[PDB]
Amino acid sequence: MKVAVLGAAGGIGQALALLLKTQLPSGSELSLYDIAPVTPGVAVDLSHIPTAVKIKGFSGEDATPALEGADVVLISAGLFNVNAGIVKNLVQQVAKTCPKACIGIITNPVNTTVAIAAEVLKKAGVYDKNKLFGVTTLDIIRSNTFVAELKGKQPGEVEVPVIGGHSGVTILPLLSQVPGVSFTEQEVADLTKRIQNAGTEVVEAKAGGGSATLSMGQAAARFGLSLVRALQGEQGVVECAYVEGDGQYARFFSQPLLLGKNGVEERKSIGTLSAFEQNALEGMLDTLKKDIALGQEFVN
Numbered sequence: 001m002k003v004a005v006l007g008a009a010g011g012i013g014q015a016l017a018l019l020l021k022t023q024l025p026s027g028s029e030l031s032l033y034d035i036a037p038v039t040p041g042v043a044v045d046l047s048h049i050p051t052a053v054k055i056k057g058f059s060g061e062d063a064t065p066a067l068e069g070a071d072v073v074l075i076s077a078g079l080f081n082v083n084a085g086i087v088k089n090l091v092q093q094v095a096k097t098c099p100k101a102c103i104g105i106i107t108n109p110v111n112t113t114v115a116i117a118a119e120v121l122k123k124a125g126v127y128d129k130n131k132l133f134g135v136t137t138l139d140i141i142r143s144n145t146f147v148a149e150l151k152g153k154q155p156g157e158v159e160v161p162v163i164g165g166h167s168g169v170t171i172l173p174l175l176s177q178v179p180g181v182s183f184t185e186q187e188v189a190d191l192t193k194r195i196q197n198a199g200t201e202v203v204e205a206k207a208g209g210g211s212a213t214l215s216m217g218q219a220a221a222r223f224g225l226s227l228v229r230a231l232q233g234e235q236g237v238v239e240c241a242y243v244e245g246d247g248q249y250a251r252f253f254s255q256p257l258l259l260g261k262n263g264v265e266e267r268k269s270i271g272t273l274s275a276f277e278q279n280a281l282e283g284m285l286d287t288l289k290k291d292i293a294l295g296q297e298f299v300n
């Protein structure tokens with residue numbers, strides 16, 4: 001089982017690679033790619049950690065040697081103006097070298113870059129909707145932290161389902177479905193708005209000198225490890241991710257997914273929604289649809 005990290009020299013990629021090197025199952029392989037010439041040294045650095053995970057790093061313009069035999073590709077390289085071209089270039093190389101891998105797009109804006117990725121893989125004739133994921137786990141683990149903080153629970157024991165998209169008002173935490181926890185509607189409103197704007201807390205506290213790299217690395221690592229477990233035959237693995245489903249709300253939509261050996265095994269129902277959640281769901285479908293079309297038209 002091989003995991004390739006495209007964008008491994010950035011802050012997100014390095015934290016992701018550090019977590020994968022120490023937590024991937026024994027016998028796994030990790031390949032790091034980025035443009036920067038330091039990337040081979042990041043792998044050598046990590047290769048000194050005594051886990052049964054083989055790691056190698058590659059630099060330059062060609063990601064092929066890092067992608068050969070890859071089962072999972074995580075793309076954290078790279079707002080729309082800059083990352084759209086980066087995503088298309090890397091997904092094109094994925095479509096030529098490991099077209100059957102599961103692809104997790106971390107590069108933002110996820111709502112749009114997943115649509116770009118889908119259309120690029122379509123042009124190569126290898127697009128598989130069961131294998132393309134927008135990684136939205138950062139909204140989930142932030143929700144877990146904020147809910148446990150407000151309710152005095154252990155943060156490890158709180159799991160909040162989060163649906164919709166990965167930006168602004170498209171992020172919908174289903175607080176009504178957190179077992180053993182009840183909220184007032186003012187708690188729901190303030191908690192939902194904090195989750196939807198959590199990124200701004202980081203950049204403001206960084207004096208504008210950066211963004212959320214370590215927690216995003218942890219989020220991507222959680223989704224990546226869940227994927228690897230499911231691909232290796234583990235049962236009951238459920239994660240929310242931004243995928244092309246039945247299009248009931250939008251072409252791409254984040255929802256609980258049962259993962260399997262093929263990627264998506266079943267797209268689970270979002271369940272019963274509260275009045276607040278149903279309102280917030282229908283009230284953001286248009287801005288989500290425009291995010292998708294922005295990505296489609298860039299390729300088409």
Ligand SMILES: [Ag+]
Nearest residue numbers: 071100101102
């Ligand atoms: Ag796969």
